[PDB]
Design a protein around this nucleic acid. Structure first.
Lengths: 151, 151
DNA sequence: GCAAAACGTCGTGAGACAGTTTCG
DNA sequence: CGAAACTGTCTCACGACGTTTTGC
């Protein structure tokens, strides 16, 4: 899906404001390396303004909105559409462009990360960088925590 | 000054996110009708990201940045530059377009609001409308306050 | 007497994760 | 196995005012 540049310009400003580009390493025994590499693009807004997030679902054509009381979030996790979307959005980001670029990097490196523990750990390293670029305050699992479990 | 369109598209999204279009009636004795009609365009950001606000000062070409601890704000209150700015920004705003058009209306009517208490009140009613559109929760002075004083 | 700067603050509206679950 | 959803909440990073002082 090719997005309109005006939509992307406005949206990149909005994302730099209320948005969040997130990479997480989730402990999970069902994966071969006991952790899932999770990626999320999100936009949070007061629920009385969810109409704005509902429109995003329509305009971006993928993702959904979750309600959590007083605020709601537009969430996009599917890696394929995420890569497609972030690729077109990143040229216009000013505050979260580095995060976007790290996420695109991780996505493309995913297949290779599933094959090798050293690669996987390398990818986890880029997740650490995204978190350090964000206003990270409650992170727990890092590349360090993953190395210890692999060992 | 005329701003580039892509600049305004991005900024409108950033403003709809971290910005605030403010209208205030400030009790102050030195004014004929005992209140100042104050208008402010602002963008708030964590002080570590103060460079982005400083950059806005240069790109918008007027206004300034103030510090208040963990966060800083880009501030624009000069009525003429503010009017020129919002006129060009409002077409691209989505959550705060009404507030912006009401601020523009107030500015245009300031001259006549000065000559008549009743005009002053009507404009103060437009300030009520802006506060209602924002997520107002600590407002003290309203057009009802002024109505009482004007007696 | 008004515009504009300066300085101060309530109560969130966000951001940024964590943990667990679903099911092709 | 693993992509993606579902559910919770911590810690702010904002928004949106308010009061007081400048300066022409």
């Amino acid at each position: 899906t090719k997005y309109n540049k005006e939509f992307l310009l406005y949206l990149a400003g909005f994302v730099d404001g209320d948005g969040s580009i997130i990479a997480q390493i989730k402990p999970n025994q069902s994966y071969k390396f006991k952790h899932q590499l999770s990626l999320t693009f999100q936009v949070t807004e007061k629920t009385q303004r969810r109409w704005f997030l509902d429109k995003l679902v329509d305009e971006i054509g993928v993702g959904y909105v979750r309600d959590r009381g007083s605020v709601s979030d537009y969430i996009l996790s599917e890696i394929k559409p995420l890569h497609n979307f972030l690729t077109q959005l990143q040229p216009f980001l000013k505050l979260k462009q580095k995060q976007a670029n790290l996420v695109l990097k991780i996505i493309e490196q995913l297949p290779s990360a599933k094959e090798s523990p050293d690669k996987f750990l390398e990818v986890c390293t880029w997740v650490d960088q995204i978190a350090a670029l964000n206003d990270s305050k409650t992170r727990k699992t890092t590349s360090e925590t993953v190395r210890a479990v692999l060992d």
